[PDB]
Ligand binder design. Structure first.
Ligand SMILES: COc1ccc2nc(C)c(O[C@@H]3C[C@H]4C(=O)N[C@]5(C(=O)NS(=O)(=O)C6(C)CC6)C[C@H]5/C=C\CCCCC[C@H](NC(=O)OC(C)(C)C)C(=O)N4C3)nc2c1
Ligand SMILES: [Zn+2]
Length: 197
C-alpha cells in the first residue's frame, strides 16, 4: 500500500495555432518539463487558443475547447486530472462509452461554438496543423476527400472537426482503416458533448 504510485496529470505541451491565415503547431513545453508538470499537476504556463496539444507520461494527443470545456478522448486521458496553475483539476465530465472526457477550460483558452449549420462539408485539424477536408457521412462518421496513411492521423484524437464557418461539429475519436489507409474517421458529435453537459 505505502508504495502505490499515483498517475500523473495530463499536461498541455503546445497548441495548434488557428488565429491567422496559416495553421501551425507550437510547442510550449519540452519533454522534461512535461514530466515534472505531470507529477506535480502545477502548470503555470500561459494557455492560448482553441486546440491544445496534450501529453501524459506515455501518450500525446489533442484537446479542444467547446462551450468553456476542454474536451478530449478517454482512450488518451483515462480518468486523469489536468495540470493547472493551482494544481491538478479533476475531470468534470467522464464518459467511457463515448470515449469522452472534459475539464473546465483553462484560463486564457478560447472556445469553439457548437455548429448549428446542418452542413456536411467539414474540416479535420491534426496535431501537425494539417486541415483535412472531410465529407460528413453519418451522425458520427466522415470520409477523407484524400485518404491518408493512419500514421498521418495518429496523435490527433481529441482534435476538432469544424464546419466551413469554423464551428465545432465533433471531436476526432478513431480512424477507419483499410490496409493501413484511413479513408474515413469517426468522431464524437458536438450534440453528444452538449447532452453530456
Ligand atoms: C480505454 O477506454 C476506451 C473507451 C472508448 C474507446 N473508443 C474507441 C474508438 C477506441 O479506439 C482505439 C483508440 C482509437 C485511436 O487510435 N484514435 C486515434 C488517435 O490518434 N489516438 S492517439 O492520439 O494516437 C492515442 C492512442 C491517444 C494517444 C484517432 C486515431 C489515429 C490513427 C489510427 C491508428 C490505428 C487505430 C485505429 C482504430 N480504429 C477503430 O477502432 O475504428 C473503429 C471504426 C472504431 C473500429 C482507432 O482509431 N482507435 C482504437 N479506444 C477506446 C478506449
Ligand atoms: Zn457551422
Amino acid at each position: 500500500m505505502a508504495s502505490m504510485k499515483k498517475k500523473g496529470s495530463v499536461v498541455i505541451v503546445g497548441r495548434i495555432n488557428l488565429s491567422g491565415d496559416t495553421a501551425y503547431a507550437q510547442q510550449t513545453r519540452g519533454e522534461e518539463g512535461c514530466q515534472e508538470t505531470s507529477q506535480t499537476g502545477r502548470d503555470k504556463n500561459q494557455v492560448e487558443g482553441e486546440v491544445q496539444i496534450v501529453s501524459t507520461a506515455t501518450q500525446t494527443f489533442l484537446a479542444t475547447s467547446i462551450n468553456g470545456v476542454l474536451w478530449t478522448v478517454y482512450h488518451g486521458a483515462g480518468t486523469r486530472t489536468i495540470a493547472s496553475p493551482k494544481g491538478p483539476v479533476t475531470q468534470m465530465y467522464t464518459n467511457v462509452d463515448k470515449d469522452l472526457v472534459g475539464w473546465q477550460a483553462p484560463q486564457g483558452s478560447r472556445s469553439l461554438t457548437p455548429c448549428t449549420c446542418g452542413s456536411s462539408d467539414l474540416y479535420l485539424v491534426t496535431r501537425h496543423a494539417d486541415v483535412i477536408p472531410v465529407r460528413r457521412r453519418g451522425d458520427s462518421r466522415g470520409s477523407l476527400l484524400s485518404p491518408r496513411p493512419i500514421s498521418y492521423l495518429k496523435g490527433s484524437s481529441g482534435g476538432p472537426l469544424l464546419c466551413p464557418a469554423g464551428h465545432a461539429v465533433g471531436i476526432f475519436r478513431a480512424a477507419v482503416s483499410t490496409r493501413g489507409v484511413a479513408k474515413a474517421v469517426a468522431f464524437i458529435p458536438v450534440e453528444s458533448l452538449e447532452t453530456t453537459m
